[PDB]
Amino acid sequence: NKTVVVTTILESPYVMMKKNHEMLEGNERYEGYCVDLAAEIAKHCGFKYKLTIVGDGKYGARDADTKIWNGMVGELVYGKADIAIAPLTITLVREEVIDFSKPFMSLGISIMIKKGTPIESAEDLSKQTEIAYGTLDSGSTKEFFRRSKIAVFDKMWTYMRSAEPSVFVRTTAEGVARVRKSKGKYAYLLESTMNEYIEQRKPCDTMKVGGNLDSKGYGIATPKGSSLGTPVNLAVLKLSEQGVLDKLKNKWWYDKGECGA
Amino acid sequence: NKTVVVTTILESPYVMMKKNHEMLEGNERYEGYCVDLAAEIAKHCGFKYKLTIVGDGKYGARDADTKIWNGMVGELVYGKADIAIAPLTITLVREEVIDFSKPFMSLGISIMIKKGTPIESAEDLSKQTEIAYGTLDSGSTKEFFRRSKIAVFDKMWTYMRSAEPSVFVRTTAEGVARVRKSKGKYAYLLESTMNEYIEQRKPCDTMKVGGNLDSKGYGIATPKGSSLGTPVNLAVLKLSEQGVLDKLKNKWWYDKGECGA
Ligand SMILES: CC(C)S(=O)(=O)N[C@H]1Cc2ccc(Cn3cc(CO)c(C(F)(F)F)n3)cc2C1
Numbered sequence A, B: 001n002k003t004v005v006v007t008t009i010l011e012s013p014y015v016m017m018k019k020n021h022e023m024l025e026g027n028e029r030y031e032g033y034c035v036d037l038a039a040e041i042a043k044h045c046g047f048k049y050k051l052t053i054v055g056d057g058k059y060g061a062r063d064a065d066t067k068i069w070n071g072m073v074g075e076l077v078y079g080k081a082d083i084a085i086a087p088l089t090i091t092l093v094r095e096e097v098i099d100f101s102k103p104f105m106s107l108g109i110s111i112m113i114k115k116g117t118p119i120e121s122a123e124d125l126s127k128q129t130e131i132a133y134g135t136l137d138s139g140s141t142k143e144f145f146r147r148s149k150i151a152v153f154d155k156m157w158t159y160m161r162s163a164e165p166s167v168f169v170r171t172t173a174e175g176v177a178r179v180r181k182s183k184g185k186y187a188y189l190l191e192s193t194m195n196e197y198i199e200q201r202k203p204c205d206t207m208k209v210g211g212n213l214d215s216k217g218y219g220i221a222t223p224k225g226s227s228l229g230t231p232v233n234l235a236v237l238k239l240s241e242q243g244v245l246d247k248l249k250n251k252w253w254y255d256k257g258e259c260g261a
């Protein structure tokens, strides 16, 4: 029995720095959905743990030249972290080199606009040029478009990969900031979960439009062959069944809404 | 390399007998979402297979006295089938004795009424007595209510377990038949997937009402420690990503709709 190093990422409402964080030390610097979930998984698996923010601030992609994984995936892979507890999407390129528990939350790629933007769908975006759009770097959303064989999404990806200036953003906060400050002339593609939280946060100037483009989920990830893999997974199933996963969704989404009803 | 025995269950639109089935032999007797999915999993894993309907017609529960599993779970457990490819819900009591791939489709428990029934929610059902309601025997929906510690669902379960005549049904077709032929005086609790298919099938006299009561999914199941476990799971992830899972949902739900738009 050894203290587990948890890799995670600063992403609202999953993991956020408390406002008085310079007061505080350790796990107490952080609050969020995945902070709460880590404390539940650690209880049901019987371990002690250290929350730690991914040094490079990325989710995880592999450089096509070096074949080096960055982000939280690379933290696991190179043995710097023992478990990743974060909105980290379950994908094939990833499930190869790490293990994922069953999905604790569902999401699909969605479109965020400034209120008033004449865009209702992904089709609407691919058929025009006035409103720019993009995704996050180093993540599952970017790769969905890169590797897509569907007509509209390949059209979107060819626009996106060569557009000037860049339509790609380093953090979600950056994509959101660009929607808000671009006067309706940028739309952001992000996961439905993140979009729905932000949609209900002041200044209440963004909106989610269109149906989800895919159906995926987030998993707890452990390095390939870890002894934490099976206990962690039974713990997700059990918290599902206890209603604890729904209760934490309500806490950090619905109860945090500032944009009316 | 040996021919895989697939256990599955007659449930619309997942697996149905073709109308000329007495013409036909083998896998060709059957059509459906899970028929199509079995053919994809078998291709991507490189195996040959036999579709076979569970002899007892159940999903899988364990007798509390004998501790014997019935249904498709018990077919796997006692080594009669090699893989279960069906709308079989991923649960903790089950993930113990069998392995489940990641979820290929999502569902929640939902409420089906005859059109015109004054019921909008699960709360509405628990607070009245004129309209009877129940679930399927030997399945995850029945166990959700039995083991629930939430107020409304425990209230529902206490009513349901001792109501006369029985509110429990052996097959989904039976629950649906009871809604249709009970003049609004029975409501059925079933998975949202099954409800949404039936809702769009003639005589177009049922309706799904209220939000889902839980968030679960169906998995492909193999006996604990099978060599098919990891290939099958990579195949679900890959078909997800190829869009094949969405394409098969559309085929057997949206394209099969007879109740207008
Ligand atoms: C293999 C890929 C398709 S995936 O990304 O891993 N799965 C997708 C599709 C889907 C379906 C349902 C659910 C919901 N769900 C929650 C739980 C609780 O562990 C579960 C449980 F695992 F228990 F079924 N499901 C999520 C997702 C995302």
Ligand SMILES: N[C@@H](CCC(=O)O)C(=O)O
Residues within 6 Å of the ligand: A059, A060, A087, A088, A089, A136, A138, A139, A140, A141, A142, A189, A190, A191
């Ligand atoms: N959850 C995604 C990041 C968000 C996005 O790509 O939109 C990932 O794990 O890569």
Ligand SMILES: N[C@@H](CCC(=O)O)C(=O)O
Residues within 6 Å of the ligand: B059, B060, B087, B088, B089, B136, B138, B139, B140, B141, B142, B189, B190, B191
């Ligand atoms: N899919 C469920 C059966 C349907 C239901 O219980 O409503 C199971 O695997 O047990």
